[PDB]
Every structure is written in structure tokens, then in C-alpha cells.
Design a protein around this ligand. Structure first.
Ligand SMILES: Nc1ncnc2c1ncn2[C@@H]1O[C@H](COP(=O)(O)OP(=O)(O)OP(=O)(O)O)[C@@H](O)[C@H]1O
Length: 286
């Protein structure tokens, strides 16, 4: 069960929030790696801007990822809400974010061959499909991107960062919101025109991620550049390290590219659902 963690425990597990335990900061707050007094390896997120943008994000995760468990979603282990302080505690994912691995620090890190990236794309997709289909009310993530796909010890994908997620009734096609949420290079185009979000928006953003697995490049655009070279020579867009592995899987890559293109359609009604995406990934291996 989700644990209510005392603020002092988190203070001491991070050595008084010392810089040496900091592994990320900006916008939302801070993220620290720590070992809890019971031995648990965890990531502890310290939210800033409480009683406003910070407290809304806190409740967003509590009402979504804090209420569900799934093999392809980051497990939220605990929380701490003491006055002005807002903290959330997650199981520590060994290999960090997909963005860090994909754009390796000093060109060094874990090498991801196609078999592993394909596993990452299927796991990521199953995570979102659970949010869109199996959860009632459905969950719209609203900020899917490669920094929000974490990789555990087995290089399995686990979707993270529900600070902007929202609940939508199953008897609704969209959710009208107050603000525009998302990251440059991942926003669905219809989010710029309407204060509305949907599972088809998550599908768009998932498409960008699958493109990062296929091309190896950052979204900042990348979506349009692939769409332009898709009508020319689609052999000049995939990650060069994937073609070194085997040029015989270029046919398999193109089929995954078609899945990505369908997710990235400017029309939300034409995008697949994540359940269709999963089924499509399965037909490629059959
Ligand atoms: N459970 C976890 N296990 C291991 N590392 C984590 C975990 N959660 C977060 N991190 C690391 O902390 C950093 C911040 O994570 P978070 O998702 O809160 O930032 P973000 O909003 O995605 O940042 P940005 O999108 O600006 O890169 C990430 O780079 C990630 O690698």
C-alpha cells in the first residue's frame, strides 16, 4: 500500500537535501536518489510552488499513479505532505530516463539495440493503454515524452511523471481543461487550438517517443522532418546504429515507422488508440 512517509525520514535519506543526492531540478522542483531506512532504493521528488502549481501536480499523481499499479508504470511508493512541503517517493529506476540513454551523457551509457528499443516501445504502449482503456475513469497523461519513460534494471519501460494527468469519464470523448499542458515538440496540434485534452493526445505524444526510438534524434521539428523524408528516401531517417545491427530488419523498422506516423496524424480521429497500437506491434512479430 501507498506509504505516508515522515518528512524527517526523507530529510535524512537525502542528507538534508544535499546537492550530492540531487539528480534533477527545474520547473517542477527537485528529484533526489536515496536509500530509505529500510533499505529501499528510491527517487524522492521535492515539489516547489506549493499551494498553486505545485499542490495541483501533487494531487494529480495521488489521484492517478498513486491509485494504480502496473508493470509499465513507475510505482509510486509513498508521499509526504507536511505544510509547505510536497514530496513523492518512487522506486528507483536503474538506467534513468530514455532521453538520457538515447542522448547519452558524453556519448556514453547503456547501448540500446533494436530488440531492446522495440521492447521499450511495446512496454511504453502497454502502460498508456492501461491508462486509456483499463482504468475507469480513464487517465490522460498529458505530458508523455522520452524523459518520462524510465528504464529499470531489465531495461523495461515504465511511464512516469503524472503531475499533469487528469481523470476523464469513460462516457466522454474529451476533457475540457483550464491550461495548455505539454512539452515543445510533443504537443498535439489540436491542443494549441482548444483547451481540451484526450487520450488521442497522449497517442500523438507517444508517436513522438516512438520516433525517438527509431531515429535517435531529439524532437526539437523532428515530426515534420520525418514526414517530409517519408515521401522521399525513408532509408535515410532511421538510427544509423540500428542499421549496423542488421539491414534485414529495415522492413520491420518501416512497419514501426508507419505506426508512429499514424499516431502523429494532425487529425485526432484518425490516430490509433493505444489498444490498436499494441495489436499492431503484435501483428508485426507474427
Ligand atoms: N523513479 C526514478 N528512478 C530513477 N530516476 C528517476 C526517477 N524519477 C525521476 N528520475 C530522474 O530524475 C530526472 C527528473 O525526472 P522528472 O520526470 O521529474 O523530470 P522532467 O520533468 O521529465 O524533466 P525534463 O522533462 O525537463 O527532462 C529525470 O532525468 C530522471 O532520469
Amino acid at each position: 500500500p501507498l506509504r505516508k512517509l515522515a518528512f524527517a525520514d526523507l530529510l535524512q535519506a537525502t542528507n538534508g537535501f544535499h546537492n550530492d543526492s540531487l539528480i534533477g531540478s527545474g520547473g517542477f522542483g527537485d528529484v533526489y536518489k536515496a536509500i530509505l531506512k529500510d533499505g529501499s532504493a528510491v527517487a524522492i521528488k521535492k515539489l516547489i510552488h506549493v499551494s498553486g502549481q505545485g499542490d495541483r501536480e501533487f494531487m494529480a499523481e495521488m489521484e492517478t499513479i498513486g491509485k494504480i499499479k502496473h508493470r509499465n508504470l513507475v510505482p509510486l511508493l509513498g508521499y509526504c505532505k507536511v505544510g509547505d512541503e510536497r514530496l513523492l517517493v518512487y522506486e528507483f529506476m536503474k538506467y534513468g530516463s530514455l532521453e538520457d540513454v538515447l542522448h547519452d551523457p558524453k556519448k556514453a551509457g547503456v547501448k540500446l539495440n533494436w530488440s531492446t528499443r522495440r521492447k521499450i516501445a511495446i512496454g511504453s504502449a502497454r502502460g498508456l493503454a492501461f491508462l486509456h482503456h483499463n482504468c475507469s475513469p480513464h487517465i490522460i497523461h498529458r505530458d508523455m515524452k522520452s524523459s518520462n519513460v524510465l528504464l529499470d534494471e531489465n531495461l523495461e519501460a515504465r511511464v512516469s511523471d503524472f503531475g499533469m494527468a487528469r481523470l476523464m469519464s469513460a462516457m466522454d470523448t474529451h476533457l475540457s481543461v483550464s491550461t495548455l499542458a505539454g512539452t515543445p515538440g510533443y504537443v498535439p496540434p489540436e491542443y494549441y487550438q482548444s483547451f481540451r485534452c484526450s487520450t488521442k493526445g497522449d497517442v500523438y505524444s507517444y508517436g513522438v517517443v516512438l520516433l525517438e526510438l527509431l531515429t535517435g534524434k531529439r524532437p526539437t521539428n523532428l515530426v515534420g522532418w520525418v514526414k517530409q523524408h517519408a515521401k522521399l528516401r525513408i532509408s535515410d531517417v532511421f538510427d544509423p546504429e540500428l542499421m549496423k545491427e542488421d539491414p534485414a530488419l529495415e522492413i520491420e523498422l518501416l512497419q514501426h515507422l508507419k505506426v508512429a506516423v499514424a499516431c502523429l496524424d494532425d487529425r485526432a480521429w484518425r490516430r490509433p488508440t493505444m489498444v490498436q497500437v499494441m495489436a499492431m506491434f503484435k501483428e508485426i512479430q507474427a
